[PDB]
Design a protein around this nucleic acid. Structure first.
Ligand SMILES: CC[C@H]1OC(=O)/C=C/[C@H](C)[C@@H](O[C@@H]2O[C@H](C)C[C@H](N(C)C)[C@H]2O)[C@@H](C)C[C@@H](C)C(=O)/C=C/[C@H]2O[C@@H]2[C@]1(O)CO[C@@H]1O[C@H](C)[C@@H](O)[C@@H](OC)[C@H]1OC
Ligand SMILES: [Mg+2]
Ligand SMILES: [Mg+2]
Ligand SMILES: [Mg+2]
Ligand SMILES: [Mg+2]
Ligand SMILES: [Mg+2]
Ligand SMILES: [Mg+2]
Ligand SMILES: [Mg+2]
Ligand SMILES: [Mg+2]
Ligand SMILES: [Mg+2]
Ligand SMILES: [Mg+2]
Ligand SMILES: [Mg+2]
Ligand SMILES: [Mg+2]
Ligand SMILES: [Mg+2]
Ligand SMILES: [Mg+2]
Ligand SMILES: [Mg+2]
Ligand SMILES: [Mg+2]
Ligand SMILES: [Mg+2]
Ligand SMILES: [Mg+2]
Ligand SMILES: [Mg+2]
Ligand SMILES: [Mg+2]
Ligand SMILES: [Mg+2]
Ligand SMILES: [Mg+2]
Ligand SMILES: [Mg+2]
Ligand SMILES: [Mg+2]
Ligand SMILES: [Mg+2]
Ligand SMILES: [Mg+2]
Ligand SMILES: [Mg+2]
Ligand SMILES: [Mg+2]
Ligand SMILES: [Mg+2]
Ligand SMILES: [Mg+2]
Ligand SMILES: [Mg+2]
Ligand SMILES: [Mg+2]
Ligand SMILES: [Mg+2]
Ligand SMILES: [Mg+2]
Ligand SMILES: [Mg+2]
Ligand SMILES: [Mg+2]
Ligand SMILES: [Mg+2]
Ligand SMILES: [Mg+2]
Ligand SMILES: [Mg+2]
Ligand SMILES: [Mg+2]
Ligand SMILES: [Mg+2]
Ligand SMILES: [Mg+2]
Ligand SMILES: [Mg+2]
Ligand SMILES: [Mg+2]
Ligand SMILES: [Mg+2]
Ligand SMILES: [Mg+2]
Ligand SMILES: [Mg+2]
Ligand SMILES: [Mg+2]
Ligand SMILES: [Mg+2]
Ligand SMILES: [Mg+2]
Ligand SMILES: [Mg+2]
Ligand SMILES: [Mg+2]
Ligand SMILES: [Mg+2]
Ligand SMILES: [Mg+2]
Ligand SMILES: [Mg+2]
Ligand SMILES: [Mg+2]
Ligand SMILES: [Mg+2]
Ligand SMILES: [Mg+2]
Ligand SMILES: [Mg+2]
Ligand SMILES: [Mg+2]
Ligand SMILES: [Mg+2]
Ligand SMILES: [Mg+2]
Ligand SMILES: [Mg+2]
Ligand SMILES: [Mg+2]
Ligand SMILES: [Mg+2]
Ligand SMILES: [Mg+2]
Ligand SMILES: [Mg+2]
Ligand SMILES: [Mg+2]
Ligand SMILES: [Mg+2]
Ligand SMILES: [Mg+2]
Ligand SMILES: [Mg+2]
Ligand SMILES: [Mg+2]
Ligand SMILES: [Mg+2]
Ligand SMILES: [Mg+2]
Ligand SMILES: [Mg+2]
Ligand SMILES: [Mg+2]
Ligand SMILES: [Mg+2]
Ligand SMILES: [Mg+2]
Ligand SMILES: [Mg+2]
Ligand SMILES: [Mg+2]
Ligand SMILES: [Mg+2]
Ligand SMILES: [Mg+2]
Ligand SMILES: [Mg+2]
Ligand SMILES: [Mg+2]
Ligand SMILES: [Mg+2]
Ligand SMILES: [Mg+2]
Ligand SMILES: [Mg+2]
Ligand SMILES: [Mg+2]
Ligand SMILES: [Mg+2]
Ligand SMILES: [Mg+2]
Ligand SMILES: [Mg+2]
Ligand SMILES: [Mg+2]
Ligand SMILES: [Mg+2]
Ligand SMILES: [Mg+2]
Lengths: 47, 271
RNA sequence: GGACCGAACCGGUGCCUGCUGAAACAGUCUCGGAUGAGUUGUGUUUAGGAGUGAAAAGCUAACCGAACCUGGAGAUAGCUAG
RNA sequence: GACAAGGGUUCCUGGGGAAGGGUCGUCCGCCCAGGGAAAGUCGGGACCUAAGGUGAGGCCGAACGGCGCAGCCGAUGGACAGCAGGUCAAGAUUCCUGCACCGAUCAUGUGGAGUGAUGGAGGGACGCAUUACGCUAUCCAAUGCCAAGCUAUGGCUAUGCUGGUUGGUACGCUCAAGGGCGAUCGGGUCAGAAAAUCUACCGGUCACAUGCCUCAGACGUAUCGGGAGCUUCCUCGGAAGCGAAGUUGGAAACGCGACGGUGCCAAGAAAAGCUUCUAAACGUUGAAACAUGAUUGCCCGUACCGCAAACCGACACAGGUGUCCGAGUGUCAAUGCACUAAGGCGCGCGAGAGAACCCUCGUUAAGGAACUUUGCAAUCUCACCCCGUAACUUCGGAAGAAGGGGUCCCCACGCUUCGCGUGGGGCGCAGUGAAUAGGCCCAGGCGACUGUUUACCAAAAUCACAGCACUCUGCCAACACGAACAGUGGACGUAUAGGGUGUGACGCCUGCCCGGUGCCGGAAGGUCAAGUGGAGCGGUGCAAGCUGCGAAAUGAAGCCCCGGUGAACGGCGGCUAAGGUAGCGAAAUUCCUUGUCGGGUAAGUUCCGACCUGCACGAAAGGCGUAACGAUCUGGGCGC
RNA sequence: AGAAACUUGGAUUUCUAACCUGAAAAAUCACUUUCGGGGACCGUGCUUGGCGGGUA
């Protein structure tokens, strides 16, 4: 009955982290998209 | 000359394993061993390519000297003969009068402590490495170079002979273990005699686990699959219509060789 | 010793119980493996007609004969409702 | 009980009581405020490298982008100096106490000169199972020691009872298993790019036991702690002082000695630190290194939950969660079972009642499967000794076959102890006295076998499997991912190899049919694109010329045509190319069907055996057998 | 109809600077080079026709 979400600070920082989004173009597109929405840090790194 | 077992288990009844008594028991000899087996079942970009590779006992690499060209005129003593995990064809450690160790393939019948030699002035003794121009007609050799330099390539698995045939200028006919006839440059080096461990064909891996220990992994039939997965697969019951491989083609007698420059450099290839 | 019995551990055989559950797959009892083709941690690599798969069209973040999200997009609806 | 992950103040104190808490609530993991978290030595970083990631130059590519050597990043691994105690309400190898250690910089002296790299050497550098010797942790006994007191119920008056019984450090000609060991001179340049006094090879010499070197651990002396308890105060229950003893016997690790031994094959990381050598450079008055004193010690993590009410599950959820410790008695052994220590808890509604019915249990007359689709379910069996044990077999096995006996307490005698044998005696319905512990057999179908699978209705007769066969591939291999003359897998592989395909241990075997299709080979002829060729036909112009169309001949692969090809797709029949060789047959195949006969039963639509009339078996989509195996499916029997 | 020359095409053959490719002090690349082997082939760019349930 192990469930889907098994936390992990290095996992989450690695995939999803701001350095990871900034790497690929399409990630930087997620960054421009969220900034445009004015999200309170959509970037997952250190909120 | 191969081990057997009483049927004390269902799978030891057939299992057989090779003789080791002739192998010197010694570690692979550090510094001659880049190890880094780095087992890799897949392909350059993360896709599987040759199906069914899978982990077996970790190996280390022994760096064979497949050319033996720079020690010409320099005698070497046979230090020992050893298992090689990756070669199916025991290696022979070599202590040169230069005082540098080097591995070689083990010729069948190469006793420990024999002297061996390389270079054009080298008698066609067992284990010597000399050019094909200097090999007498009909002689049996292994560890031959496809090109002068670049190293040997054609006679390397255990029991593999290549017998010399004729001699055109700047070239030498030969019979490959496959039986094809090949012109080959007289400047290529080769080693005298057949490859050793000749009886390796007859070991019978007695159980599944053995093929797993070797790193081969269970090998699916198409007929067991589903149409989605493979052409033979699907259908209620069992069979198949048209016989073709994974992605489609012949597996009976579709010629696979192309129309290459190599095609001019061999006589009567078949079988 | 892909040997035996058998805890841990991995599993899931038959019955019952549970069925607005204690639980969106479980419990007691029973049962298979248990030095091996074994079990497990961390790091990491392969993905959508694509990956993986001792092969069920299985699995690919709780319903995969082709995932999710956004978008084309108010798709089209000889059909049903109003 | 201690951790990692994850959580994020949930920790401690003082308050609170709306809401969360399945009821309550004066309480709480809830609300409010204040405090608590201490490191040269533990983990990480200023060190190292693996998979993987990244990558100046470099190789590709409609863009964006994909690769890729050195290099760099990256612990899950390598390297590395501290132990014993005390104690906040709340931290502790971090603070305090006692002693110790590590690098750095400097000063005094000894020394007295050589230091010695981005480069060489060696070394760090490793598997699995099993196993001898010694030892500690640690546990057990007692009329050993120490401390306390009482005891009474019937008795004991202590040889009863309860509790305790050593950790660190330093010295030691004390004991001590186990464990590691070559030393050297010279030679060859052809060996480490060069060098080298380092390493590799060759040779001259002792390289027997030995001989060195090493202390696990023990004993002892000292010393710093600790120590059962005791003393006083007491603001409700804490605080501070003092402090005995430390025996003899036994058991024992997966820890230590260790990098021990032996056997095995599937043959068991890298790099730095580290030890040697030189190049270069400085230095050869003032060097290395040693000693003593000093100053010096950065950054991050430490609270609390952490098998769970503090993490994943929407919950204070019966689920899930990697490592480490995990005492005692009994019982062949054990992390098993029963009771229990330390420790932790009684699961955040409660009280009555003692109807139907439902769940989970205990017993049951006579009968014993008559139940039913089926013995489904639940009984029966049950551990360890002893005797005994079949067809069949691949000679291993079937086998824990089947079956029978023993099992407790006491005395004596014997023995290899704990324990056991023997003899005699005692008690109960009963002695593995409670708990953990197989029901067995005959006979078939299918698969040889262990294994694998439909996360969440299918575990199988499915997949895989060893073995077998065909076929492909000569190496920039065949095949496979791919923007692609990049790169990569195959593979640092080489025909005893690798891909594909079907078959599926083992044994006897594997028949007839190349017409159709695929494949392999042939090649006189038929056919066949673009292109080469340009006969001729037409427009326009007065003309030169410019222009539309276009025929023969010639022109590849391919197909027609010929031959072969079956563990190639395939076929082997009707009241064609061939027409079933062995084997088996009412079958997992049989329609008519409950075929007919027999066996089993009182009675047999099932099941076993025969027959053949095979609707519509048959030889690697393998045929027929086959010991062993099976939570397989089918029929019987014993026991219950 | 016999010779010379300009030749232009086709096929056999052979050669070497294009190009491919391998060892050596410098691991992918670049270099010298000894050189070595292949070699106007292959690879690739455009076009011709065949095959093409692999895919759509
Ligand atoms: C009882 C178990 C489940 O029901 C069924 O299987 C079936 C129920 C009906 C009888 C059936 O109706 C029939 O359809 C027919 C086509 C026609 C017929 N007509 C003639 C009337 C009709 O009668 C269905 C389709 C009706 C429909 C409402 C439906 O889809 C109900 C779905 C699920 O709620 C039910 C469950 O109760 C959930 O049980 C789950 O079991 C798992 C194993 C658990 O892990 C757990 O999952 C977390 C649990 O909860 C999900
Ligand atoms: Mg913010
Ligand atoms: Mg951050
Ligand atoms: Mg034998
Ligand atoms: Mg695939
Ligand atoms: Mg196979
Ligand atoms: Mg299938
Ligand atoms: Mg299907
Ligand atoms: Mg298909
Ligand atoms: Mg069928
Ligand atoms: Mg098919
Ligand atoms: Mg394929
Ligand atoms: Mg076993
Ligand atoms: Mg499973
Ligand atoms: Mg379980
Ligand atoms: Mg069993
Ligand atoms: Mg078993
Ligand atoms: Mg597809
Ligand atoms: Mg799913
Ligand atoms: Mg969810
Ligand atoms: Mg869909
Ligand atoms: Mg619409
Ligand atoms: Mg539209
Ligand atoms: Mg439509
Ligand atoms: Mg944390
Ligand atoms: Mg509290
Ligand atoms: Mg309240
Ligand atoms: Mg309030
Ligand atoms: Mg309340
Ligand atoms: Mg209330
Ligand atoms: Mg409080
Ligand atoms: Mg690094
Ligand atoms: Mg690397
Ligand atoms: Mg990259
Ligand atoms: Mg790389
Ligand atoms: Mg680490
Ligand atoms: Mg340390
Ligand atoms: Mg450290
Ligand atoms: Mg300190
Ligand atoms: Mg206190
Ligand atoms: Mg604490
Ligand atoms: Mg302490
Ligand atoms: Mg020196
Ligand atoms: Mg021992
Ligand atoms: Mg006593
Ligand atoms: Mg006592
Ligand atoms: Mg003492
Ligand atoms: Mg480095
Ligand atoms: Mg703590
Ligand atoms: Mg914290
Ligand atoms: Mg819970
Ligand atoms: Mg677990
Ligand atoms: Mg224990
Ligand atoms: Mg115990
Ligand atoms: Mg015990
Ligand atoms: Mg227990
Ligand atoms: Mg608790
Ligand atoms: Mg009675
Ligand atoms: Mg009876
Ligand atoms: Mg009846
Ligand atoms: Mg009946
Ligand atoms: Mg019946
Ligand atoms: Mg039953
Ligand atoms: Mg017999
Ligand atoms: Mg016997
Ligand atoms: Mg049997
Ligand atoms: Mg058995
Ligand atoms: Mg009696
Ligand atoms: Mg009796
Ligand atoms: Mg009992
Ligand atoms: Mg009981
Ligand atoms: Mg039957
Ligand atoms: Mg099976
Ligand atoms: Mg299922
Ligand atoms: Mg799954
Ligand atoms: Mg099931
Ligand atoms: Mg290339
Ligand atoms: Mg099959
Ligand atoms: Mg046949
Ligand atoms: Mg019958
Ligand atoms: Mg029938
Ligand atoms: Mg009868
Ligand atoms: Mg009858
Ligand atoms: Mg039936
Ligand atoms: Mg019959
Ligand atoms: Mg059949
Ligand atoms: Mg067949
Ligand atoms: Mg079969
Ligand atoms: Mg049969
Ligand atoms: Mg099984
Ligand atoms: Mg059944
Ligand atoms: Mg039965
Ligand atoms: Mg075309
Ligand atoms: Mg289609
Ligand atoms: Mg078509």
């Amino acid at each position: 009955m192990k469930r889907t979400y098994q936390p992990n600070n290095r996992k989450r920082a690695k995939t999803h982290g701001f350095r990871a989004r900034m790497k690929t173009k399409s990630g930087r597109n997620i960054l421009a998209r969220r900034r445009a929405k004015g999200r309170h840090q959509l970037t997952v790194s250190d909120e | 000359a191969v081990k057997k077992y009483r049927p004390y288990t269902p799978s030891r009844r057939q299992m057989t394993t090779a003789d080791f008594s002739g192998l010197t028991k010694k570690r692979p000899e550090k510094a001659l061993t880049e190890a880094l087996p780095k087992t890799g079942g897949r392909n350059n970009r993360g896709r599987i390519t040759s199906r069914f590779i899978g982990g077996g006992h970790k190996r280390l690499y022994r760096i064979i000297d497949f050319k033996r060209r720079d020690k010409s005129g320099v005698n070497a003593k046979v230090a020992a003969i050893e298992y090689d995990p990756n070669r199916s064809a025991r290696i022979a450690l070599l202590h040169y009068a230069d005082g540098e160790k080097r591995y070689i393939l083990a010729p069948e019948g190469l006793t420990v402590g024999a002297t061996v030699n390389a270079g054009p002035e080298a008698e066609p003794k067992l284990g010597n490495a000399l050019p094909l121009r200097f090999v007498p007609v009909g002689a049996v050799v292994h560890a031959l170079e496809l090109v002068p330099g670049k190293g040997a390539q054609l006679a390397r698995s255990a029991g593999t002979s290549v017998q010399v045939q004729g001699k055109e200028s700047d070239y030498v006919i030969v019979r490959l273990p496959s039986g094809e006839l090949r012109r080959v440059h007289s400047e290529c080096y080769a080693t005298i005699g057949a490859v050793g461990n000749a009886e390796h064909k007859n070991i019978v891996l007695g159980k599944a686990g053995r093929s797993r220990w070797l790193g081969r992994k269970p090998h699916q039939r198409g007929s067991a699959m589903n149409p989605v997965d493979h052409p033979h697969g699907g259908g209620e019951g069992r069979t198949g219509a048209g016989r073709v491989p994974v992605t489609p083609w012949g597996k009976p007698t579709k010629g696979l060789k192309t129309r290459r420059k190599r095609k001019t450099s061999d006589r009567f290839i078949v079988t």
